[PDB]
A paper describes a structure:
Pyruvate carboxylase (PC) is a tetrameric enzyme that contains two active sites per subunit that catalyze two consecutive reactions. A mobile domain with an attached prosthetic biotin links both reactions, an initial biotin carboxylation and the subsequent carboxyl transfer to pyruvate substrate to produce oxaloacetate. PC is mostly found as tetramers of four identical subunits, with monomers of ~120–130 kDa in size. This enzyme possesses a tetrahedral geometry with the tetramer organized in two layers. In this work, we study the structure of Lactococcus lactis PC (LlPC) during catalysis in the presence of positive allosteric regulator acetyl-CoA.
We obtained a cryo-EM map of LlPC with acetyl-CoA under reaction conditions with an estimated global resolution of 2.12 Å. This resolution should allow the identification of side chains, the substrates and products of the reactions, and even ions and water molecules. However, there are large differences in resolution throughout the protein as observed in local resolution estimates. This initial map is a mixture of the different conformations of the enzyme during catalysis, and hence, BCCP domains are not visible at the current density threshold. After symmetry expansion of our dataset, the first step of our analysis is the separation of catalytic states at both BC and CT reaction sites of all the subunits. LlPC has a specific activity of 127 min−1 which is slightly increased in the presence of the allosteric regulator acetyl-CoA to 154 min−1. In summary, we have resolved several catalytic states of LlPC with the allosteric activator acetyl-CoA and the motions that LlPC tetramers undergo during catalysis.
Author numbering:
A (entry chain D): 0 to 90
B (entry chain B): 472 to 1055
C (entry chain C): 662 to 852
The structure:
Amino acid sequence: HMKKLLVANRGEIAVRVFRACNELGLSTVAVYAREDEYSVHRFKADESYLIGQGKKPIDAYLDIDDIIRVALESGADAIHPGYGLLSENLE
Amino acid sequence: TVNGFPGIENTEKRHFEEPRQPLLNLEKKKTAKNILDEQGADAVVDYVKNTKEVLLTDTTLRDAHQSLLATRLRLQDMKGIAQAIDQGLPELFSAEMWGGATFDVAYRFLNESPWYRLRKLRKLMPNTMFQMLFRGSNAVGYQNYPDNVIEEFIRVAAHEGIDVFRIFDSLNWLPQMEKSIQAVRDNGKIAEATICYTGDILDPSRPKYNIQYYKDLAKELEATGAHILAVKDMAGLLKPQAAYRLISELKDTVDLPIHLHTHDTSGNGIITYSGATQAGVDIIDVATASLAGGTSQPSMQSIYYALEHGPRHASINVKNAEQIDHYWEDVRKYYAPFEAGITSPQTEVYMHEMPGGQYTNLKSQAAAVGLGHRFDEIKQMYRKVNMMFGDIIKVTPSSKVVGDMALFMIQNDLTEEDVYARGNELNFPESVVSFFRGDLGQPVGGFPEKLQKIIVKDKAVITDRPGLHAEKVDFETVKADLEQKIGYEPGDHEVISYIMYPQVFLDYQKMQREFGAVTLLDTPTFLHGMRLNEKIEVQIEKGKTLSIRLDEIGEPDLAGNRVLFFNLNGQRREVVINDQSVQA
Amino acid sequence: AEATICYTGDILDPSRPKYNIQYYKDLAKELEATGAHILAVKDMAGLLKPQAAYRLISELKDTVDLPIHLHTHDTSGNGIITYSGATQAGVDIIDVATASLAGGTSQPSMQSIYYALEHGPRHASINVKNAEQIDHYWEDVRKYYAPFEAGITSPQTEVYMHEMPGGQYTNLKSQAAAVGLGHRFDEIKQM
Ligand SMILES: [Mg+2]
Ligand SMILES: [Mn+2]
Ligand SMILES: [Mn+2]
């Protein structure tokens, strides 16, 4: 049932989940802040979307509503949070 | 960046602000596209007949930039405003977005497919009728094609989203339009039979194209099943009193709705449209204000305010139109290398009757060679050549015939008596001999037969439809040949465009294989490349955006190559490009 | 002496009743009280719409006995049709420019206004072949004044909103360009 997964993270953990998703045959969606535009994980996914426009980049990666909005408009079936940003966040 | 765009000056890239986005007051209403969608073309005709306001056809996407910007307006600029036009101007009868010179120009100079433009605009504009200028037997080419080629083009264009086909013959010859009209009817679309206006119906000294000629042509066109009668005034020759008289006589003759199309070359386009609105015209072709006037169509906002408190209003949301015109004003600045220059009303178009595209191309061809300083004598030669040919209708491609004949006659210093007496020795231009051989059809009143015998020498002259004498085209054979030439199996649109423009399509395919989809670049970047330290973002598809930054331009080596230091997607990439100026 | 009424607003707009048709009528009567030979209507910003032109000229011609002189600009692209509508209403003199210096913020072309009225009830009194011959000189000498030329000029119906005269438009653009406010010239027009 899953065909596309979003990673709500950055850096090496996003690339790790992208590699696992490609091995499992799923599509990958990246998110990135404006200050993270040159990150490798942005260019390692099938689709990348700017999130948290105008915010601080850490706050941009904590933009919960923007992340779900990107995941919904991209048609992602699931969200992998990785670690360190919203992985332990109940909300 | 290193070699410049072909055909324009190698100037630096100016910094441009983002084009202003309209603030629209959206009002939902059922458009003519919706009526064509559920009900048929006849219900669209009934909708036009029962509308008391005059309807508007936007020529911004085709004819306005064909006249002013040498047809160079790109899909990337259309895409930023297509949805705004579709939603903010639902009262538009149709949007002229295809046909004419757009098909050739996109492939040749813009390196984008006209089919791709049609698909993207159709997705962006679901509730707007799409209109193309169809040249009848020529379709979007300049030569003639067999009948099945024309029918296949109509089928593919109607399937890909063309709703209205404005079908005209360059000499108003109904045999070169009947089959196209029938194919458009068969494909469930609206066929617009078109009368090309020339001369002066209120001038008794020119009786070849008088009111009765247009009335007879009108009932002949209504004899075919064409839904709308179109009056095409390609040079802006229709005077306002003549407009009222002509439209009144046509409304007395036929029951079809009348669609008037004029240019504003003489500065009388608005008043001509108003006179036709008094006479009861149904639809008029307008352009947005920032791409109106001069050789283009009269302004849509201006025609709203011209008819604001009269008996018939213009059906448009004028505030939304002005908001869209802000965007058009901003994106016109991208096309400064293609501008004609200082413009003004010119009533000399009533004398030489040169259509605006023919005017610009004749000016370019006359100034490229060194005899352009007597362009007034060139225009007088054009007028006398038109009179010599028997006062022919001058539109694409017969305007090219008169233009090439006049260009030859002042290029090699000829005279009317020179051609009429000792013309059997000169090598005449090939467009003139093809016109006199009947490749463009049969003119009104026939050829100047003994003069025709001077032009044609030992070549075959045909007197019937040139499409009957056309070599047959098999679509499977052509498709297999094209699948050999290009590296994949082509679509029907690719096959049909390869038939009309074979070398142009193959050159476009080669440029696609070399440079890719350059249609996705913005117009300043498309025309000027990149400056040093500039950052650009190219969205190549949904979710993919290339971050490109030019860091350094290397000095040319002994082989003439420059190394350009790009930063693509954060990573340094060194691109080697041959500088054509140093020449190894 | 040409006593002149500066036209502004919109007589056919009921939401702007200060400059209505009665105001222009009483002003025309007051001007005819003075011994002025010709009543002039100055449309300095090209605000006179064609239906408004017909209505205003008709109501002035049934009010005063002076000949009417209409002067308008073509900035909205409606100058020729406004002149034609005033010609239907019986205007006597209209202000035109040569074709090479016409259009945009300038007056409508005299050649264009000849051909607009060529077969109507009222013709334009001009030798149009002679005027078309003069226009060649005028475009040739217009090429001398390239540094003083404005940019790409298109019809602009936004003059019906801000009602700037063309000279006022150019001077406000020059002021917005000399100081750092030119990126909000739309806000300047709304202001
Ligand atoms: Mg109607
Ligand atoms: Mn046209
Ligand atoms: Mn003035």
